Amino acid sequence: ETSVVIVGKISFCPKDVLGHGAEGTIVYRGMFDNRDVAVKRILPECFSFADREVQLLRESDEHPNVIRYFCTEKDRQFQYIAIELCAATLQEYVEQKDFAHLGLEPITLLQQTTSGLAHLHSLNIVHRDLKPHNILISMPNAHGKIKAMISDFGLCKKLAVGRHSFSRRSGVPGTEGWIAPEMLSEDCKENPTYTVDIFSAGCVFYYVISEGSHPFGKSLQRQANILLGACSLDCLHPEKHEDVIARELIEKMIAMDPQKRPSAKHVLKHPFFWSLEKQLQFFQDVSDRIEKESLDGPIVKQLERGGRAVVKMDWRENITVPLQTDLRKFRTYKGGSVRDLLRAMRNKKHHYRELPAEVRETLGSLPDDFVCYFTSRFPHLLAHTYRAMELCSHERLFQPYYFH
Amino acid sequence: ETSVVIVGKISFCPKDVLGHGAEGTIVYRGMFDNRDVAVKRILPECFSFADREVQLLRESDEHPNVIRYFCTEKDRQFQYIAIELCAATLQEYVEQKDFAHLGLEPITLLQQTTSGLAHLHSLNIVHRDLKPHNILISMPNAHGKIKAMISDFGLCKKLAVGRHSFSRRSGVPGTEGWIAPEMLSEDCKENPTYTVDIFSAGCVFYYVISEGSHPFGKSLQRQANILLGACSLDCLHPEKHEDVIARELIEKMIAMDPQKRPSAKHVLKHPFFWSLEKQLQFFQDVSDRIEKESLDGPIVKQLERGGRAVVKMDWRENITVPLQTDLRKFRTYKGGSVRDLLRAMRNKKHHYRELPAEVRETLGSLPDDFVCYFTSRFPHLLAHTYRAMELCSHERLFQPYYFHE
C-alpha cells in the first residue's frame, strides 16, 4: 500500500527517497513522460537557486557529460525538478568496494568530467561547486556502458557579457573543502574566474586515483590547508611513471596562483590522458626532431638538463640483458644521455620486426608493452621530455601534444 | 493579433507552420518548458506512427546526431510531439545556392549523419525512410556552429529480438527515389535488413558532394533507374584523388546486392573521412611495413598488381623537376614500382627538415601540402594501396585504417 504524488507531468512516490542534501531539499525517484527520472523537491526559499539551476541546465545539458534536464513544475508549496536518474555519485564509485566499473575506468571518468566542465566554460558558465557528490555515475545504456556527468547547478553563475571574471558579491558559494583559495582570501586582488573549477577538479582528480584521499587532508582540516597551501600528493609514488605524470598535472591544477592553473581544454591535452600508443609516438617524434640537432643547441641542452636522474646515471645499465646485448652492436648510444636513450628507443621501434626473437621477447609487443618497457624503467622520462620539448610546442609536428 | 495553443507543457502559435508531414500531420514552431522546440501535431488515425516514433525516440535520442525528444501531449483531437527545433533540412543546405555552411563542411555532415545512423542500427532500428528531407541541420549553438541530425522515426522498424531482418508485409515505406531495390523487387528471397538504410545513405552521400545530383538521375525516373541498376556518378572525375576515393565508397553503398554494402560503422572507417595527415600516416605505415617484405611475397605482388596505371608507367617522370633531381641518386627506387614510390615518399617525409629549400618548396609543408603533392599527381595511389593492403588489415598496425565485423 504505497502512495503517489502527481504535480503536472511530474510524479513520484514519497517512499522512494534517493537522498537529502542542501536546505532540506529531498530527491525522490520519480516519473515524467513515462521515463524514470530523479525528482528534486525545492523549498520556497530556494526558488532562487532552482530558477537559476533550471535555466543554466537548459543551455548546457545537451553535452553527454552534463546531466540531462527534463522538466520543472510549480506547486502550492514546492518546486519540482525532473532530471536524469543516475546509479550513483563519484563518491560511491571511489569508496564502494567491488564497484561495477562497467567499462568506466578512472581516467576516462576524469576525462568525461573535464569535458563536461569545458563545455560549461565555453558557455561562460562557472560551476563553483565541483565535488564528488556533484559528479554522477549514469545508469547503464542499452549496451551496458556507463559514463560520468556533472550536476547540481544551483550555485553555477553565468558570467556577465564581456567579463572573464566574477565577484564574491553573492558571498562565497560552494562546499567547505573543495573551494578555491582565492574565493576566501580577503587580500585577494584578482577576481575569481573559471579556474576555481579547475582547482576543485584537481582535488577530485587526486581523490579518484588515490581511491579516497584528498590533497589537503581530512574533512575538517581541508579548507584551512587550502588557504595555507599545505597540499600532499604522497599517494602518488615518485618512481611510478603513471603517478609521476599524474602529479605533474594535478599540482598545476591545484596551484595556489589561479593564473597558473590550466584551463579545462588545456587539461584535456595532458599526457595523463594519452594512450600507450600516443606516448610512444611522442617519444618517436622528439627523437627524429633532435637527430640532427647539435649537442650545444638550446633543445638538446634543455633535454639533458637534469638528465642523469632520468637515465638513472646509466640507462644501458638499467635495461634487460638481451637488449644490452643487442645494443653493444651500436655503442654510439651513450648511457649518460637522455637524447641517446630516445634515439635507441626510436631505433628499436623502427627496426622492431627485424629484431631477434629474444630481444622482441624482452621488449614485448608494439606499441603497448614496448613503451611500458621504458617508462616503467625510466618513470621520469615522459614528464622530463614533455617539459623540455615545450621549446618546440609551436612547431606543426608537436601541435597535437600541446595546447594553444 | 496572434493566437496561442497550450496543451499541457507544450505551447505553439498556429501561424508559425514549419512544414507539413504525411497524412495530415503539421509541424509548428513552439515552446516546451521555456525551450524553443518543434511541435508535431498528429491525427488520431496516425496515432500508430506517433507512439512508435515517441518510443524509439525515447531510446535513441541520446546521440548528438539524432534529433532530441522532449515530451508528448495527447489532446481530445490530436497528439503533440515536442522535439528539438532545427534550422533547415539537408535539401535546403544543398539546393539553396549560397547556403551558409557556418563551419559545417559537406564531409563532416556526412560523417555526422552516418554516426547518427550507426547509433540507430546498434539499437536494432532500421530507419527505412532516410532522405535529405529528414536529415536536419541544427540551430546554431552559442558558438554559432551547426551539426546534422537524423529525424522522422514514424516509419522506423524495431527488429524483433534475435532478428537481423524484417519482412516486407507492411509494403513500401520509403520515399520514391531513395528506396533500396530489394524493397521493390518481386523476386528477392532475402528479407531486407539494415542495409536498406545504407543504400539511401549512399544516395545522400553523392547528393551532397555533387551539390544536388542523384546517382539515379532526375526525380521523374530515379526509382525506375534504381530497379534497373542504372547508376551514374558523372560528377566524380576519374583522375581526381578526392573523387576517386568518394566513388569507391559510394559505389559500395548503393550496390545492388544488399550484402555487398558496408555497415554504417564500416563506412565511417573509409578513407573518404581521412584527414590529410591520416592519409600520409597510412602511406608511411605501409611503407615501413613492406620495407623488409619479399618482392615475390603476397603483399608486394598485390601492391604492384595494376601498378603501371597507378604510377603512370614511371613516377619519376611525373613528379616535379626539383624532386626528380633530389631523387636521381636514389637508384634503389624503381620508377615503375608502387612500393618504391611509397618508399621515396616515406624517405622524403622522414628527412624533410634536412632537405634543401628548393625541394621543400615544391613539396610544400608537412603534412598537408606534402601528401597532396603525391595524391594529386597520382590520383589512384591511395585507393589502390588501401585496397591492396587489406591483406594486413587484421594486424595491430593497420587496425585503425580498416573495419572488423
Numbering used by the authors:
A (entry chain C): 560 to 963
B (entry chain A): 560 to 964
Give the exact sentences the study uses for this entry.
The B2B dimeric and oligomeric IRE1 complexes are stabilized by phosphorylation of the kinase activation loop, which in human IRE1 occurs on residues S724, S726, S729, making phosphorylated IRE1 (IRE1-3P) the most active form of the RNase enzyme. We determined the crystal structures of G-9807 and G-1749 in complex with IRE1-0P at about 2 Å resolution. The structures are shown in Fig. 2 together with the structures of AMG-18-bound-31 and apo IRE1, including the first reported crystal structure of human apo IRE1-3P. All structures show IRE1 as a B2B dimer, with extensive overlay of the RNase domains, but some differences in the kinase domains, especially in the conformation of the activation loop and αEF-αF loop. A possible reason for this is the stabilization of the extended activation loop conformation by the extensive hydrogen bonding network that the phosphates on S724, S726, and S729 form with the backbone and sidechains on the activation loop. A similar stabilization effect was observed in the IRE1-3P sample. This suggests that stabilization of the activation loop in an extended conformation by phosphorylation or binding to allosteric RNase activators may stabilize IRE1 B2B dimers through widespread rigidification of the kinase in the monomer context. In one case, phosphorylations on the kinase activation loop can stabilize an extended conformation of the loop, rigidifying the kinase and stabilizing the B2B dimer as a consequence.
The lumenal domain senses unfolded proteins in the ER through indirect and direct mechanisms: as a result, it undergoes dimerization and subsequent oligomerization. The association of the lumenal domain promotes dimerization and oligomerization of the cytoplasmic kinase-RNase tandem domain. The cytoplasmic domain has been shown to self-associate via different surface contacts, where a back-to-back (B2B) configuration is believed to fulfill the essential structural requirements for RNase activation.
